[PDB]
Amino acid sequence: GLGYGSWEIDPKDLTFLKELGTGQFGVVKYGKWRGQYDVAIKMIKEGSMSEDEFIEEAKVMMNLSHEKLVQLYGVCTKQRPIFIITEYMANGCLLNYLREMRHRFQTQQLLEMCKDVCEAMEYLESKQFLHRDLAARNCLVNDQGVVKVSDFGLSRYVLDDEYTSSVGSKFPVRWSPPEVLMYSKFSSKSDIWAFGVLMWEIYSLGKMPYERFTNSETAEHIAQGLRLYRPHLASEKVYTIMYSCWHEKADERPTFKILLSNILDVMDEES
């Protein structure tokens, strides 16, 4: 209605039902939009986000529509804290889901999770849109057990310097290729590297990558040309796929289209 652009949701249309938890921008709630539609509501803590830049980017993000991407529905930006309204994913973050041993996952279920994420990433790659912080903690799981990629590009708007540089103390060192750690060279191939690490997280049922090392030690390890090794649940063919994401030379790493093809081939050979 009047006073709201196509990217803008009227907060008066929201019914708040449950608190999901706190993320790095603050509290996230579950609710309904116009009494019927499930939504998640990020409530953005004052001083945590580059809000004007995010709002301009939200316009681009809302047009990134793919079944395996958590949809941005709109933003509430007339008052602080601002809200980001997203698709609701009932089974929570992927990292926590993997760590719940009750699920007793078959490897075919783990490969399907990888395929979900790979499809999202092939879509973003086709739109020349980098995720910039791909990891299991940034994927969500719906009530059907479908995995979707969330928070694509959002690291660009984080004002906490601990997150936004290697000199910072919350930077995703363990998901980063050597050229990011050495030179801050972000590209499609840094997303590819991260996706390999995410496959490793899935097949390890949510272990921390390089779990016995510090971030500094991890940086040195990968700079010496050394890598993660094979999760017990990963077949030889699955391991080859994740390992292909870690070529020292970025231009030798596959595309998301190639990875998707490889993952489908393994699904065919292993089901």
> Which positions make up the binding site for dasatinib?
86-89
Q: Does 9 bind ligand KLM (CB under 6 A)?
A: no
**Sites for ligand KLM among residues 132-171 (CB under 6 A):** 140, 150
Span from 58-66, 89-97, 201-209, 262-270 in contact with ligand KLM (CB under 6 A):
89-97
For residues 40 and 61, which CB has a smaller minimum distance to ligand KLM in the complex? 40
Residue nearest to ligand KLM (CB): 21
Q: Which of 14, 40, 111, 121 binds ligand KLM (CB under 6 A)?
A: 40
Q: Does 113 bind ligand KLM (CB under 6 A)?
A: no
Least distance in Å: CB of 271 to ligand KLM? Answer: 29
Span from 90-98, 170-178, 209-217, 255-263 in contact with ligand KLM (CB under 6 A):
90-98
**Sites for ligand KLM among residues 54-73 (CB under 6 A):** 70
For residues 65 and 184, which CB has a smaller minimum distance to ligand KLM in the complex? 65
Q: Give, in order, the Cα–Cα distances in Å from 83 to each of 28, 132, 159, 174, 182.
A: 9, 22, 17, 30, 36
Annotated active-site residue in 13, 116, 133, 191: 133
SS (H, E, C) 97-118: HHHCHHHCCCHHHHHHHHHHHH
| 52 has catalytic annotation | no
Span from 22-30, 46-54, 106-114, 125-133 in contact with ligand KLM (CB under 6 A):
22-30
The DSSP result for the chain, as a single string, is -TT--TTB--GGGEEEEEEEEEETTEEEEEEEETTTEEEEEEE--TTSB-HHHHHHHHHHHTT---TTBPPEEEEE-SSSSPEEEE---TT-BHHHHHH-GGG---HHHHHHHHHHHHHHHHHHHHTT---SS-SGGGEEE-TT--EEE-STTGGGGB--TTTSSTTSSSS-GGG--HHHHHH---SHHHHHHHHHHHHHHHHTTSPPTTTTS-HHHHHHHHHTT------TT--HHHHHHHHHTT-SSGGGSPPHHHHHHHHHHHHHHT-
Q: Which of 26, 92, 145, 153 binds ligand KLM (CB under 6 A)?
A: 92
Tell me the number of residues near ligand KLM by CB under 6 A: 16
Q: Does 89 bind ligand KLM (CB under 6 A)?
A: yes
Span from 59-67, 83-91, 124-132, 219-227 in contact with ligand KLM (CB under 6 A):
83-91
* CA dihedral sign of residues 185, 186, 187, 191: positive
For residues 75 and 89, which CB has a smaller minimum distance to ligand KLM in the complex? 89
The token duo for 30 is 């579950």
Q: Which residues are annotated as a binding site?
A: 20-28, 42, 86-89, 154
For residues 140 and 194, which CB has a smaller minimum distance to ligand KLM in the complex? 140
Q: Which residues are catalytic?
A: 133
Using CB under 6 A, list all residues that contact ligand KLM: 20-23, 28, 40, 42, 70, 86, 88-90, 92-93, 140, 150
